Amino acid sequence: LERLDVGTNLKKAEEKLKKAEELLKKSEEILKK
C-alpha cells in the first residue's frame, strides 16, 4: 500500500519558520538595546 508523503517539504518549511522566529527575536533585541 503506497502512501502520500510530503514530509520532507513540510519539515524544511518548519525549520525555515523556526529560523525566522530566532532572527526576528534577534532583530527586536538589537532595537531594544
Partner: protein
C-alpha cells in the same frame, strides 16, 4: 544618535534574513501542495 542609526541598520539586516527564511518556507509549502495534487492526480 549614530548608535540609533547603527541599531536600525543591524536590526533591518537581521529582519531581511528573517523574511528570506519565511520566503524559503513558502517555496517548500508550494512544493508540498504540488506533491499532494500530483499524488491525487497520478
Amino acid at each position: 544618535n549614530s548608535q540609533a542609526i547603527d541599531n536600525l541598520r543591524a536590526s533591518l539586516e537581521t529582519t531581511n534574513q528573517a523574511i528570506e527564511a519565511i520566503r524559503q518556507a513558502g517555496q517548500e509549502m508550494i512544493l508540498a501542495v504540488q506533491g499532494v495534487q500530483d499524488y491525487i492526480n497520478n
